[PDB]
């Protein structure tokens, strides 16, 4: 429901 704005930094 959330996008890789779950702060994907990897």
């Amino acid at each position, epitope marked *: 429901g*959330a996008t890789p704005q*779950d*702060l*994907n930094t*990897l």
Partner: antibody
Framework: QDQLQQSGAELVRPGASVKLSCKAL????????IHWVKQTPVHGLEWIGG????????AYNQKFKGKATLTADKSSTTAFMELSSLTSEDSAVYYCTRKDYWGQGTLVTVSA | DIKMTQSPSSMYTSLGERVTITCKASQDINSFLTWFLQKPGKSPKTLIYRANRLMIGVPSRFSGSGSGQTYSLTISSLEYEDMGIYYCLQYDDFPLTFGAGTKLDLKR
């Protein structure tokens, strides 16, 4: 979107190893990082590390680097966490999280 | 290591009351913060993510706010099912760090 499913409660002897598993369901497994977190009454909640199943990139807390090994299997959409040389201090609940979703946790009891 | 200072640490509240829990980060975390609740013998349930996004299925009581260093979670009218420990989680940078928790008790 759906969820994380963790492997069952584990009962190991001092100095052994455990491999915990975390199955991702209902979402594109390769677009999100999977993180492992440890919880004990003493220390509270602590981050171990995480993997990005797309790129394979990993990151670890300096305290678990050398003890914890993180791997991911794309065909089974399962993230794994290996723990070596266990002592009673490793006795805890282990959780995999997507940061928004949490697995249910696996209890690892280290005892003789 | 970013440090999260959650407060208060335990609160004595009433059913139907409006509660406010806070998290200060030792530096700026760009709204990368989650709020989750854990009940006794139970896995964490995230309520809010990216500082103020409700999670599918969470009552609209719950509401997050802040920017920079000071974040908040407000529970507009406490219900019995809300009782447990609340935590904030910063995911701006590694290592991930958590507040120490906020325990809610019905006063009497």
């Amino acid at each position: 979107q759906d969820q994380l499913q963790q492997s069952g409660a584990e009962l190991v002897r001092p100095g052994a190893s455990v491999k915990l598993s975390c199955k991702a369901l209902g979402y594109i497994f390769t677009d999100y990082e999977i993180h492992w977190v440890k919880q004990t009454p003493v220390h509270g909640l602590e981050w171990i590390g995480g993997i990005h199943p797309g790129s394979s990139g990993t990151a670890y807390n300096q305290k678990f680097k050398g003890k914890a090994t993180l791997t991911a299997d794309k065909s089974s959409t399962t993230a794994f966490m290996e723990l070596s040389s266990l002592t009673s201090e490793d006795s805890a609940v282990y959780y995999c999280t997507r940061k928004d979703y949490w697995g249910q946790g696996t209890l690892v009891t280290v005892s003789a | 290591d970013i440090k999260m200072t959650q407060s208060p640490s335990s609160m004595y509240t009433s059913l139907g009351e409006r509660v406010t829990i806070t998290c200060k980060a030792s530096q700026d975390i760009n709204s990368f913060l989650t709020w989750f609740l854990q009940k006794p013998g139970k896995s964490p349930k995230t309520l809010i993510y990216r500082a103020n996004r409700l999670m599918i299925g969470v009552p609209s009581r719950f509401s997050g706010s802040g920017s920079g260093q000071t974040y908040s979670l407000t529970i507009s009218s406490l219900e019995y099912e809300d009782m447990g420990i609340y935590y904030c989680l910063q995911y701006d940078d590694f290592p991930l760090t958590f507040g120490a928790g906020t325990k809610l008790d019905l006063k009497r």
